């Protein structure tokens, strides 16, 4: 009975280790991607704010 | 406890991802409509009890207990992984849409600055 | 099915109406209506003609004074052609990547490089082209400080090079990635796997130098001794020292009973053991 | 490995919250701008 | 190969074109400068690409533009990071000042952390890195970023204990333990932080460490059940017994039970040296 | 340091300039009818001064400036900007004194719910509930706000949020020695979440709480409830909760407080007990 239980425990531990490693790398890639989108959206909001301000000032000057 | 908290807050993050996806979709549709309008405007044991004694007995039980927990943990672990996959996909797709929206507005601005002169 | 025929007829009618309208300032409206027709055709799910119309609209947009919109149309057309003639999609995606590089967005350029390499390797068998694309993407990402994608591309190319029997490049890349992961506080758990892969790749070159390589790996990372992978490597080396087939066969059977082997490691083990 | 994962997960969650806040600001401002554009176009005409 | 010479010649031609265009006296000049910097980037000529980026930044700033100028400054600093840490630091400080004037605290704090990292990694200067980390921590705390502030404070405390006085370590570790123990998820690790403070008390004297551990035990009942307090009490008994053999035996027993961080080892070596 | 003196001086000078600007705005409007350009510029200066005061850690001045800007823009027929400024003022007051934040958040709630925006109203309700709970022990207002937010979310169809509010409501009601509402909420939440895939693992926990919440009333009804919950969810028998509850009932049926105490101590030793669970165990021990 020793071999069966010991090998079962080893299999479970190894599977947990491998899957945790894989999903940790996946989480790292996900973090990089979300940081990139964060900066992208920040730049987009800043530029749209500037553009709408320019439009407002231009139209008010013309009217 | 750490596993359970990780799972529940992963689900919360997925909900937030869905919310932002819906918001960006609405933003894209509204921007396109406004631009067009503006354009149109113009196992039994673990220890061999060779020694007998209580020290062995308790040992065995503990191992069994741990094994069972580990068994459960195995399944649990798998579950915690699955959601990430879907989330990752979303975190990619969104980017595409976002870029287009930004591009659109920029181009619109450029057009709005070239028709006049 | 009635759905496919109805959608195809509607999309054809819309495209014909767009053609008549444009044939009869007008460039922008023509491009807009052509894009609408292309979207309707995609909804009709005829990939070849949908992609054809989309790239025609993209060319018309290129005729119009706009760059980024043309690139978006190009990438959409490439995605549509993904299930069609690979060469046209590859050329369109290369043009889009050139536009992106001219504009300066290296991240999207590297993403598109990865996409083109992936489609080339999955659809076509010619590997060197995909390897070159992956190397270009890795260079771009390293220039952009994106370590994750660069490491992924380096691992893919190293694995393939091991597959192409160029073991020197594979072992060099594996050692580099292992030391990089070891230096970082995180990802140090896979450094043992990287060192084990490097040792396996080195073994193919010869047998005597395998002992020196494993000793160097051990003295570089002492904890690597504790890993079962190091024990398996040393046991297999000792078994191979004597021309006995049972020892390493039993060892690999036990390892399989422990962990399920991937295709690459299985073929590598069979190749090493056969000779 | 678990404790190593925990910190990255926490950082990702907090910065997801920050990104959501930024997007809420952006969408609210976009709605206000659209309303202003509608007002201008309707009243000028 | 073709790439090097071709890209270098094209970038030089673009620089000359921009110089002539400005000599005529402007946005087209900035676009040409940005394109030339991009070509230089593809040619792997990291040096002088930041100079072109900075020239474009000044050209655009001349017409009151500040956002794109700040982004160009940040990119130029990042490019200079590998070529020259000093110029990268200068550009990043300029960007931080611009954003702080504009009120972008998140970007400013991230740039401050980047400045601290580059200071501590390439050059040898911790006090400036400590100040940068403190500034970033204060910025994040203003924006109620608990985790970032806690991480920055923990790193500052570790550095201070490493080289500076132990008062900073005690204060920051106690504050972090207070913040984390009440929290549900992090309480598991809370004990750890407290232990560090106690060890830092042993550096000054044994009585201070004993009082600190008693206060921690009274405040945190679970701290009593931890094996760490038992090990510290055994170490205290060894020190009052002036027996280095007991110290070594306890340290080796703990190491066998669990591996070390290599910082606890240094602190324990310092403590055992002064047993005399 | 220099921050305090310099920022305070410059912000006070800017605020005085804004006051002079608004004072002259009425005269300019009367004499020439310039419009709202001067008013808009004064509002921008007010917002900038509020931002600087917040930067310099002078929360009170920032909140005052935010309130001034909100009122001034509200008088300009723009409710959205006024509501945003009121929310900012509420945040600043929360940083300094939540009493003003309460009325600011109520104003924001009224303005938003006038148009029918349920999500923002529910979020502000939860914010006010948190403000009340963290400082004061006014459980009544907190429970009312939580129920209002839960109703708003239920009417908006946004699932996965109102359930946590209902769980908090049940916990506080049980803490208030009122168990019927807590029992009903817990059983409803458990039954609803049983069908969901992700929530299944957690469902059993709720049942156990109900059992404890259903054990104060009487032993007969508690035993019947335990039986009903076990039968409806047979898998609940696998977890330690059923064994613990059975042992507690067996010990308590014969006035053997020592056995009950030993079982509770063992359960706590294996895993630390929650404050609510420990309090309920102690209260049951009184019997």
UniProtKB/Swiss-Prot annotation, chain B:
Site ((Microbial infection) Cleavage): 93-94, 110-111
Changes after translation: Palmitoylated. (Microbial infection) Targeted and hydrolyzed by C.botulinum neurotoxin type A (BoNT/A, botA) which hydrolyzes the 197-Gln-|-Arg-198 bond and inhibits neurotransmitter release.
An example Gene Ontology CC term for this record: extrinsic component of presynaptic membrane
Topology of this chain in the membrane: Lipid-anchor
Domain of life: Eukaryota
Modified residues (Phosphoserine): 67, 100
Record localization: Cytoplasm, Perinuclear region; Cell membrane; Synapse, Synaptosome; Photoreceptor inner segment
Gene Ontology biological-process entries: associative learning; axonogenesis; calcium ion-regulated exocytosis of neurotransmitter; endosomal transport; exocytosis; locomotory behavior; long-term memory; long-term synaptic potentiation
Residues carrying Phosphothreonine: 51
Domain t-SNARE coiled-coil homology: 1-41, 53-115
Main localization (coarse): cytoplasm
GO MF term set: calcium-dependent protein binding; lipid binding; myosin binding; protein domain specific binding; SNAP receptor activity; SNARE binding; syntaxin-1 binding; transmembrane transporter binding
This protein's UniProt keywords: Cell membrane, Coiled coil, Cytoplasm, Lipoprotein, Membrane, Palmitate, Phosphoprotein, Repeat, Synapse, Synaptosome
Family, as annotated: Belongs to the SNAP-25 family.
Summary of the function given for this chain in its UniProt record: t-SNARE involved in the molecular regulation of neurotransmitter release. May play an important role in the synaptic function of specific neuronal systems. Associates with proteins involved in vesicle docking and membrane fusion. Regulates plasma membrane recycling through its interaction with CENPF. Modulates the gating characteristics of the delayed rectifier voltage-dependent potassium channel KCNB1 in pancreatic beta cells.
Protein's recorded name: Synaptosomal-associated protein 25
Lineage: Eukaryota, Metazoa, Chordata, Craniata, Vertebrata
Span covered, complete protein: 41 to 204 of 206
UniProtKB/Swiss-Prot annotation, chain D:
Post-translational modifications reported in the UniProt record: Phosphorylated by CK2. (Microbial infection) Targeted and hydrolyzed by C.botulinum neurotoxin type C (BoNT/C), which hydrolyzes the 253-Lys-|-Ala-254 bond. Cleavage inhibits neurotransmitter release.
Residues annotated as domain t-SNARE coiled-coil homology: 1-40
Site, as annotated: (Microbial infection) Cleavage: 39-40
Subcellular location: Cytoplasmic vesicle, Secretory vesicle, Synaptic vesicle membrane; Cell membrane; Synapse, Synaptosome
Organism, as annotated: Rattus norvegicus (Rat)
Family: Belongs to the syntaxin family.
Cross-link Glycyl lysine isopeptide (Lys-Gly) (interchain with G-Cter in SUMO) mapped to chain: 38-39, 42
Signal peptide start and end residues: none
Name used for this protein in its record: Syntaxin-1A
Self-association and partners: Part of the SNARE core complex containing SNAP25, VAMP2 and STX1A; this complex constitutes the basic catalytic machinery of the complex neurotransmitter release apparatus. The SNARE complex interacts with CPLX1. Interacts with STXBP1. The interaction with STXBP1 promotes assembly of the SNARE complex. Interacts (via C-terminus) with KCNB1 (via C-terminus); the interaction increases in a calcium-dependent manner and induces a pore-independent enhancement of exocytosis in neuroendocrine cells, chromaffin cells, pancreatic beta cells and from the soma of dorsal root ganglia (DRG) neurons.
Purpose: Plays an essential role in hormone and neurotransmitter calcium-dependent exocytosis and endocytosis. Part of the SNARE (Soluble NSF Attachment Receptor) complex composed of SNAP25, STX1A and VAMP2 which mediates the fusion of synaptic vesicles with the presynaptic plasma membrane. STX1A and SNAP25 are localized on the plasma membrane while VAMP2 resides in synaptic vesicles. The pairing of the three SNAREs from the N-terminal SNARE motifs to the C-terminal anchors leads to the formation of the SNARE complex, which brings membranes into close proximity and results in final fusion.
UniProtKB/Swiss-Prot annotation, chain E:
Keywords: Acetylation, Cell membrane, ER-Golgi transport, Membrane, Phosphoprotein, Protein transport, Transport
Membrane topology listed for this record: Peripheral membrane protein
Subcellular location per the Swiss-Prot or TrEMBL entry: Cell membrane
Pfam family, one: SNAP
Biological process terms in GO annotation: apical protein localization; brain development; intracellular protein transport; membrane fusion; neuron differentiation; positive regulation of ATP-dependent activity; protein-containing complex disassembly; regulation of synaptic vesicle priming
GO cellular component: glutamatergic synapse; neuromuscular junction; postsynapse; presynapse; presynaptic active zone membrane; synaptobrevin 2-SNAP-25-syntaxin-1a complex; terminal bouton
Description of how the protein assembles with itself and partners: Interacts with PRKCABP, and disrupts the interaction between GRIA2 and PRKCABP, leading to the internalization of GRIA2. Found in a complex with VAMP8. Component of a SNARE-like complex that contains at least ZW10, USE1L, RINT1, STX18 and NAPA/SNAP-alpha. Interacts with VTI1A. Interacts with STX12. Interacts with GNA12 (via N-terminus); the interaction promotes CDH5 localization to plasma membrane.
Record's protein name: Alpha-soluble NSF attachment protein
Organism per entry: Rattus norvegicus
Gene: Napa
